[PDB]
Amino acid sequence: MPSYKSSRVLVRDVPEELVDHYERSHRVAAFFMRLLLAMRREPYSLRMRDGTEREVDLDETDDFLRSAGCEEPDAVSDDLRSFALAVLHQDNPKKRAENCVSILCLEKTREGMAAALRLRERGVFPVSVPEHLDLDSLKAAMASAAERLKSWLACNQRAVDEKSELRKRFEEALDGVDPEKYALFEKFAAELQQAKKLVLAVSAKFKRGVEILKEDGYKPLWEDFRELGFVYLAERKWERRRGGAAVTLCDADDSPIKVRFGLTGRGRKFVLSAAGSRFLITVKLPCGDVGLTAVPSRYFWNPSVGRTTSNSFRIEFTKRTTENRRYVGEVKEIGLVRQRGRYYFFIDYNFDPEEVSDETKVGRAPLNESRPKPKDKLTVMGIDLGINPAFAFAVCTLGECQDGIRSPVAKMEDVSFDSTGLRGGIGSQKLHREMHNLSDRCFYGARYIRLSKKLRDRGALNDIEARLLEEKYIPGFRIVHIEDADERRRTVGRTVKEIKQEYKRIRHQFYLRYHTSKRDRTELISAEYFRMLFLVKNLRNLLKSWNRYHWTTGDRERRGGNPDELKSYVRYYNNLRMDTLKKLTCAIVRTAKEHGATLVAMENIQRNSLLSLWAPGMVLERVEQELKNEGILAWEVDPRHTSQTSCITDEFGYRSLVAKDTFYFEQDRKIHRIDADVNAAINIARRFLTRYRSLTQLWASLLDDGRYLVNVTRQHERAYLELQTGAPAATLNPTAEASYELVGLSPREPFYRHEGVWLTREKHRQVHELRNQVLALGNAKIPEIRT
RNA sequence: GUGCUGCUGUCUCCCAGACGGGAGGCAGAACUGCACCU
């Protein structure tokens, strides 16, 4: 329920009577993770600092459990597995039985705990802990290891789901059709792999890949290269996929974990005191205590601490920012992480968000559903998550209208989108451009290395290889091609060094942005962060390729267990990702608070873009959390044609593929232009405000009679017809002007609204005529409206 | 304090193989700017 924040403080001269504890905690955590990864004998792939993954066998698991202390782990495997599953959150919550250590390491109903009791009275349970430690430290280490195993089992279930989906998609392709001829097609593949884009290249039932099939060697079927080839592709995809989620062990110097402390008994207790602008930490080990001088931290400039009746340490501090800002909260746990030698005390705490009145929550549903209205003069703000703009914004006060873009709303008067603009644009006409250039250069070199590897090993293997060489990579790497291999290798090295130097140049110019006399005018966020994120993400691969060029193409294994390869760049990229996400968070909160932003709409990006740099959901989740922590109540919105339709005429439009930021629409038989980003911002606000009263896409199928039937997936679609047609379903009947309409029904091709004539996929793709018209009339002649 | 996030001199280990890269330790200066549970 409550939220969280956390920051680190550094203790410099640490006593050894705690460094030993750190080491033993790491040891016991690793052993516990292996014990719980073996209690279920399903094998898996693992790895170490090496990075290349060995594979276990069930015999290894048997011997491991034997070393634990069991004699016939296979014989009693049932209770062990049940206890393990009940421990690591594998099962559903009601079957859910750090809290296990009191049953595990002791010497003197849900199936997990009953199984543990059986395993003990059965004479099997008590395992031999490799190292001596106190019970609370065992609890903390089990907590860490179990959390990591929880992540692993979640990811393993995910991989299982992925492989199941691949298998089902392949099955729907084969569907048992002509299995013998399928084997014949596999025999054809035998030559193909020795002699999908090819399947698309076979467009007509008319180059050795496309010449051999005509010959009698594989003529005898010739049936159709849609059924023939899709099945092979799906089988190949199901063949090539990792089905399990690997594991990394926890290593003090390679895979560190946090050594946690807190008053709640999840580790040794603690006392936090402050004096002289710095924290002082005392931890009650079984051997006594220790005094550690947490170096003063700007996150805790002038702090203080205080005990509470809630068994928590209340603190208060001032965070260095553009101004002096105040914070408070309750501290309940601390964590020790030894990164590159220095001991850091992680500080954790809860803190209240700012107050919210239910007049916000009420406003914060489908048109087929009726619920009360705001009944309050709140302000709705637009957020358009993107790349070039961090968030295009527009805020229009409901219960008021002065001037601007007039946008209707569901069952209330018109609102006006007056305050508009962009946040997070390019901080330089040159820096972002150069940075994007370098990122693309990396993306292309990282493949030309493989291309030259194959060419050196075997020579030109086919035509499309040379076509790509001359078309995409050679210009993406801008190097001279040399027939010999030695000079080509040295040219690869030269270009690698040049990319290094350009990375240094960019990195140095980009660090000075926050120190030179221009400090004040440097924006909080900008597209520069995202573009240099892309640059690092692709430079990592370019180098990782340059580390593996000396060896041939057919290899598959590491030549030596050299750890910590390119980990500096990985750490840089990840720290940057965290910082940039925080900065976008801060920019959104700042641009939202001043305007009020009592309700915020942000497109559901989940349906060279945000999805690449982050997992699809983390951006939205953390943005909702941060905006929540401030008292604001954000909200997500479907983006489907929110970026191609118009916000003044409610009709589809053209988002210029070349003028990427501009959008075009026509009103009153006149052509008008607008900033596509602000446009979108509006349309998302419009959809939030109007309860999605104007659909623009429908998928309909046909079976007979020559007329299609609408589909029913999301309640909003079901409400659209009931509002426009009057029946819960309808059909796409024809009309003279090569278009459709909706005339209901009585007891899946594209279709798009336009004016209501519903020009389908082909005729919809009218939008090209709009493009031709708007291009022919000249952009400079077009009205540009408030932006 | 963690990062953004650095730089210049120097010191060492690994991969390569005369082009290059990877990983860390110190020591100087420049500047005190921007965010901060992964």
Alpha helices of A353-398 — where are they, by DSSP H?
358-363
- For chain A residues 734-753, those near strand B by a CB cutoff of 7 A are none
Helix, strand, coil content of chain A in percent (nearest 5): 40, 20, 40
Estimate the crossing angle of helix A527-546 against helix A486-511, to 10 degrees. Answer: 150
E strands, A471-569, in order? none
For strand B, which nucleotides have at least one atom less than 7 Å from a protein CB? 1-7, 14-25, 30-38
CA–CA separation, A338 vs A87, rounded Å?
Answer: 28
Q: How far is the CA of A125 from the C1' of B14 (A)?
A: 44
CA–CA separation, A173 vs A460, rounded Å?
Answer: 33
Estimate the crossing angle of helix A527-546 against helix A431-458, to 10 degrees. Answer: 20
CA–CA separation, A604 vs A34, rounded Å?
Answer: 39
Nearest to A213 by CA among A232, A189, A178, A196: A189
The pair of structure tokens assigned to A401 is 């209208």
Q: Contact A255/A219 with Cβ under 8 angstroms?
A: no
Q: How far is the CA of A340 from the C1' of B12 (A)?
A: 17
Q: How far is the CA of A228 from the C1' of B3 (A)?
A: 54
Q: Contact A557/A497 with Cβ under 8 angstroms?
A: no
CA–CA separation, A155 vs A37, rounded Å?
Answer: 14
What does each C-alpha distance from A583 to A356, A579, A580, A617, A618 come to in angstroms? 24, 6, 5, 17, 15
CB-based contacts of A487-490 (< 8 A; 24+ apart in sequence)? A488/A452, A488/A456, A489/A452, A489/A549
**Beta-sheet pairing, A697-701 with A278-283:** unpaired
Please state whether A48 falls in left (phi above 0), alpha (psi between -120 and 50) or beta.
beta
Q: What is the dihedral of CA A588, A594, A598, A599, to 10 degrees?
A: -30
Q: Is the CB of A504 under 7 A from strand B?
A: yes
Q: Contact A755/A740 with Cβ under 8 angstroms?
A: no
Task: For residue A680, report the phi and psi dihedrals to the nearest 5 degrees.
Answer: -50, -60
Q: State the CB neighbour count (10 A cutoff) for residue A323.
A: 7
The pair of structure tokens assigned to A404 is 């601007």
Please state whether A414 falls in left (phi above 0), alpha (psi between -120 and 50) or beta.
beta
- Name the DSSP letter for residue A472: I
Nearest to A651 by CA among A749, A742, A766: A766
- Name the DSSP letter for residue A349: E
CA–CA separation, A419 vs A35, rounded Å?
Answer: 59
A491: the nucleotide nearest its CA (via C1') is B19
The pair of structure tokens assigned to A658 is 């070349």
**Beta-sheet pairing, A379-385 with A599-603:** parallel
Q: Contact A237/A166 with Cβ under 8 angstroms?
A: yes
Q: Is the CB of A92 under 7 A from strand B?
A: no
The C-alpha angle A270, A275, A280, rounded to 5 degrees, equals 30
CA–CA separation, A664 vs A677, rounded Å?
Answer: 12
**Beta-sheet pairing, A304-307 with A291-293:** unpaired
Q: Contact A495/A479 with Cβ under 8 angstroms?
A: yes
Residues composing chain A = 787
Q: Is the CB of A278 under 7 A from strand B?
A: no
**Strand-by-strand arrangement of the A636-637 sheet:** A419-423, A391-397, A379-385, A599-603, A636-637
Q: How far is the CA of A547 from the C1' of B21 (A)?
A: 7
As for chain A, the residues directly before each break of C–N over 2.5 Å are 97, 108, 195, 206, 364, 607, 747, 765
Q: Contact A438/A509 with Cβ under 8 angstroms?
A: no
Task: For residue A773, report the phi and psi dihedrals to the nearest 5 degrees.
Answer: -65, -50
How many Cα neighbours within 13 Å face the side chain of A128?
A: 8
CB-based contacts of A188-197 (< 8 A; 24+ apart in sequence)? A188/A212, A188/A213, A188/A217, A188/A218, A189/A232, A191/A217, A191/A218, A196/A229, A196/A233
Q: How far is the CA of A621 from the C1' of B25 (A)?
A: 41
CA–CA separation, A34 vs A251, rounded Å?
Answer: 12
What does each C-alpha distance from A775 to A667, A749, A783 come to in angstroms? 16, 29, 14
Helix (H) or strand (E) run with residue A10 in it: strand A5-11
Instruction: Show Cβ contacts of residue A550 under 8 Å, excluding neighbours closer than 6 positions.
Output: none
Beta bridge partner(s), residue A278? A275
Give residue limits of the domains in chain A: 21-159, 358-426+588-635, 431-582, 654-781
Resolution in angstroms for this experimental structure?
3.7
Q: Residue A450 class from Cβ within 10 Å (0-12 exposed, 13-18 middle, 19+ buried)? A: middle
CA–CA separation, A720 vs A778, rounded Å?
Answer: 36
Beta bridge partner(s), residue A327? A317
Residue at minimal CA–C1' distance from B5?
Answer: A511
Q: How far is the CA of A44 from the C1' of B9 (A)?
A: 49
Beta bridge partner(s), residue A380? A396, A599
CA–CA separation, A757 vs A765, rounded Å?
Answer: 14
A299: the nucleotide nearest its CA (via C1') is B1
CA–CA separation, A177 vs A175, rounded Å?
Answer: 6
Instruction: Show Cβ contacts of residue A256 under 8 Å, excluding neighbours closer than 6 positions.
Output: A26, A250, A337, A338, A339
Torsion sign over Cα A136, A137, A143, A149 = negative
Residue at minimal CA–C1' distance from B7?
Answer: A508
Q: Is the CB of A593 under 7 A from strand B?
A: no
Alpha helices of A47-134 — where are they, by DSSP H?
58-68, 77-87, 101-104, 111-121
3-state secondary structure at position A492 = helix
Q: Is the CB of A328 under 7 A from strand B?
A: no
CA–CA separation, A569 vs A623, rounded Å?
Answer: 26
Q: How far is the CA of A516 from the C1' of B31 (A)?
A: 8
Q: Is the CB of A500 under 7 A from strand B?
A: yes
Estimate the crossing angle of helix A179-192 against helix A227-239, to 10 degrees. Answer: 70
CB-based contacts of A178-182 (< 8 A; 24+ apart in sequence)? A178/A221, A178/A223, A181/A221, A181/A223, A182/A231
Q: Provide Rg for chain A, Cα atoms.
A: 31
Please state whether A5 falls in left (phi above 0), alpha (psi between -120 and 50) or beta.
beta
Q: How far is the CA of A61 from the C1' of B6 (A)?
A: 48
